[PDB]
Amino acid sequence: SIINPDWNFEKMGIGGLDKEFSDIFRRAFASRVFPPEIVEQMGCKHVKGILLYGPPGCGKTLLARQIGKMLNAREPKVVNGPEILNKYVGESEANIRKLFADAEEEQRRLGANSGLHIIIFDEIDAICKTGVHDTVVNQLLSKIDGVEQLNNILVIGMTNRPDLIDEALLRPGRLEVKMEIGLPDEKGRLQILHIHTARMRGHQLLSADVDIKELAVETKNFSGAELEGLVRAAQSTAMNRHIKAEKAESLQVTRGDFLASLENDIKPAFGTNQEDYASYIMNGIIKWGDPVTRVLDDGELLVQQTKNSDRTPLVSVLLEGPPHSGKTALAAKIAEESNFPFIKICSPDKMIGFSETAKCQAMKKIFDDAYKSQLSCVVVDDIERLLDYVPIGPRFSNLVLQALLVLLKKAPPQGRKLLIIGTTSRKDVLQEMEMLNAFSTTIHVPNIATGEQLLEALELLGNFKDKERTTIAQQVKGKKVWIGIKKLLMLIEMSLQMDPEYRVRKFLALLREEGASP
Amino acid sequence: NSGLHIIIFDEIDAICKQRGSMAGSTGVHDTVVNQLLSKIDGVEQLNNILVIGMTNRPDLIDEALLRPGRLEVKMEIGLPDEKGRLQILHIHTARMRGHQLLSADV
Ligand SMILES: Nc1ncnc2c1ncn2[C@@H]1O[C@H](COP(=O)(O)OP(=O)(O)OP(=O)(O)O)[C@@H](O)[C@H]1O
Ligand SMILES: Nc1ncnc2c1ncn2[C@@H]1O[C@H](COP(=O)(O)OP(=O)(O)O)[C@@H](O)[C@H]1O
Numbered sequence: 001s002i003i004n005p006d007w008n009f010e011k012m013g014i015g016g017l018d019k020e021f022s023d024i025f026r027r028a029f030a031s032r033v034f035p036p037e038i039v040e041q042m043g044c045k046h047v048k049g050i051l052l053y054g055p056p057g058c059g060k061t062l063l064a065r066q067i068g069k070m071l072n073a074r075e076p077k078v079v080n081g082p083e084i085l086n087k088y089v090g091e092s093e094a095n096i097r098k099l100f101a102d103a104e105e106e107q108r109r110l111g112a113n114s115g116l117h118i119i120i121f122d123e124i125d126a127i128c129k130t131g132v133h134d135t136v137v138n139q140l141l142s143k144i145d146g147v148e149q150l151n152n153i154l155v156i157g158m159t160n161r162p163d164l165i166d167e168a169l170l171r172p173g174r175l176e177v178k179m180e181i182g183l184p185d186e187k188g189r190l191q192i193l194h195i196h197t198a199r200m201r202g203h204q205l206l207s208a209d210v211d212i213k214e215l216a217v218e219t220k221n222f223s224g225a226e227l228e229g230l231v232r233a234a235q236s237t238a239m240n241r242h243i244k245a246e247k248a249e250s251l252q253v254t255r256g257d258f259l260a261s262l263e264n265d266i267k268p269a270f271g272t273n274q275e276d277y278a279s280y281i282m283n284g285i286i287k288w289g290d291p292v293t294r295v296l297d298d299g300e301l302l303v304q305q306t307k308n309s310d311r312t313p314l315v316s317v318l319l320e321g322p323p324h325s326g327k328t329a330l331a332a333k334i335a336e337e338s339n340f341p342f343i344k345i346c347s348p349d350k351m352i353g354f355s356e357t358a359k360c361q362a363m364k365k366i367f368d369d370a371y372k373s374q375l376s377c378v379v380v381d382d383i384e385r386l387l388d389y390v391p392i393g394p395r396f397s398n399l400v401l402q403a404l405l406v407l408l409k410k411a412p413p414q415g416r417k418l419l420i421i422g423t424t425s426r427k428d429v430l431q432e433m434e435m436l437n438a439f440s441t442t443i444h445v446p447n448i449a450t451g452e453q454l455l456e457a458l459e460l461l462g463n464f465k466d467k468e469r470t471t472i473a474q475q476v477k478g479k480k481v482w483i484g485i486k487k488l489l490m491l492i493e494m495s496l497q498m499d500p501e502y503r504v505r506k507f508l509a510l511l512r513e514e515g516a517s518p
Numbered sequence: 519n520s521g522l523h524i525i526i527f528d529e530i531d532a533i534c535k536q537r538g539s540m541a542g543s544t545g546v547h548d549t550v551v552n553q554l555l556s557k558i559d560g561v562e563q564l565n566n567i568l569v570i571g572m573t574n575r576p577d578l579i580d581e582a583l584l585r586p587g588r589l590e591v592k593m594e595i596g597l598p599d600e601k602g603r604l605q606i607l608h609i610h611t612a613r614m615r616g617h618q619l620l621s622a623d624v
């Protein structure tokens with residue numbers, strides 16, 4: 001044969017990715033497809049060196065098996081790694097020599113024309129770094145260097161620490177090409193769950209009520225091992241329920257078992273989606289007047305502008321208003337309204353006790369991650385706390401300000417897009433630090449400033465009504481009211497705590513005392 | 519077929535330490551952990567053995583064993599809250615009341 005461009009691998013039983021194939025197989029075909037003698041005449045070197053790196057559990061071993069099988073090579077030999085490297089040097093000499101001799105004997109016997117041997121290694125980072133490390137690394141390098149001239153060497157290795165491996169191992173002609181395996185993928189997670197549940201359905205024991213789509217949606221960042229453990233826990237809890245009970249003939253696994261196993265037994269690795277919106281928007285968005293609609297309209301218009309256009313891939317916004325006016329929730333709602341693939345919120349609640357350098361690193365990491373997807377939206381709230389500000393002196397951090405000022409006007413890689421939303425409550429400070437000159441536009445969030453709006457909001461929230469509402473309206477009308485939305489909830493809660501008949505008095509007294517003048 | 523054999527490794531943190539450096543000549547500590555890891559899980563498959571490892575501080579435990587496939591379902595045993603406390607005090611006082619050695623005042 002001259003070509004094997006068959007790509008049933010994704011549907012063969014392993015998801016993986018559908019991009020590596022092109023590079024891997026184009027290089028393999030270039031190396032080996034052509035007749036050997038012309039290659040000898042041209043004096044080109046066959047590719048020998050592969051390193052699949054990343055966090056464990058992503059399914060690297062299966063990829064290494066598939067590439068070995070699909071490639072027309074001999075059966076694979078593999079070692080955990082430190083095993084070969086015994087404490088005593090000299091073991092790392094005979095032991096290393098025998099592995100290479102295993103293929104040398106066949107290569108000599110069969111001459112130049114011979115098959116490819118695929119030797120798999122794991123945890124190379126452990127050995128690469130007390131004088132045993134250098135000698136072991138040199139002994140390994142000796143064969144691939146060219147002194148031993150082995151032309152049949154497929155060395156697919158694995159590791160988790162790219163910074164604790166000699167770069168000489170990747171010097172041209174040593175490892176050359178590299179790749180890493182990422183998250184289990186939402187659609188890939190769906191596919192793996194489908195494969196496992198199809199193996200289950202092979203006997204139709206699984207109940208029809210169970211669905212794959214919703215389950216895959218719920219579970220976030222569960223490596224294949226984690227999903228298999230979840231399946232095992234589900235089966236175990238179903239068995240427990242059965243034993244605590246003809247029932248055997250009626251054994252069926254229900255969704256509730258899956259939910260209980262997910263909640264109790266299996267610990268996630270990365271799951272956050274159902275925390276952000278639940279926490280930051282805790283009481284929902286309640287319309288109180290006309291000003292609430294303008295902000296949302298402008299947000300949607302800006303989202304549309306950033307979605308489809310060129311010559312302006314980067315757009316920035318700034319929400320400003322008096323304190324206790326509910327700026328974080330509205331920005332979160334604007335972020336949720338669109339359906340961008342990537343959405344993240346950077347707030348100071350998670351960086352207590354940090355120094356400025358750590359905050360810079362965290363912001364940089366979030367932005368770097370946000371640069372990858374096709375288009376994304378980011379939110380920064382309490383800009384005046386990120387750069388800790390004290391009206392005495394005044395004092396603040398220069399490094400964070402410089403990093404933010406640079407990041408706000410740095411275009412993403414070619415062809416991508418990005419949206420940034422920021423929130424603050426002190427515009428004059430930013431105006432003085434020449435930071436308001438970077439944001440493209442601004443949006444003003446006002447407070448309640450009329451008795452009619454106060455009555456409407458109170459009625460929509462409920463609680464006070466009938467004669468209480470009539471008295472409140474009579475008292476408030478013909479006056480000036482200036483109160484933030486977030487303060488109204490606290491005041492109403494406080495006033496509701498008194499005796500049933502002595503409630504309106506406390507609320508009116510509190511409202512009159514506070515609110516001051518605008 | 520057959521039954522199961524249960525091996526209880528008390529003070530398991532003594533022999534299974536981190537295989538990082540150990541800064542010591544000879545690799546007895548590393549060799550022991552590697553041999554046990556190979557035996558528990560390896561090319562051959564054993565399905566009639568269960569190991570219960572009890573430790574006082576999980577921090578000083580090698581990473582490999584806690585990984586899935588070697589040792590799973592890890593539990594924590596905390597302090598009794600209110601009812602276990604009464605049960606304990608009854609268990610440890612049953613004898614004296616059996617022989618009438620506790621005054622009615624208590
Ligand atoms: N229409 C609304 N707009 C804003 N917030 C609302 C609205 N309706 C209800 N809320 C509630 O108001 C609270 C808004 O809190 P938020 O953190 O946004 O306040 P803030 O004044 O921006 O805060 P801070 O001054 O601490 O930066 C949330 O409980 C949200 O549920
Ligand atoms: N893409 C995938 N498709 C199906 N199963 C997978 C996939 N990725 C991981 N798994 C499951 O997760 C486990 C991966 O273990 P393995 O890759 O050997 O460990 P490591 O990733 O540390 O080398 C396997 O048991 C496999 O069933």
Ligand SMILES: [Mg+2]
Pocket residue numbers: 327328381382
């Ligand atoms: Mg806020």
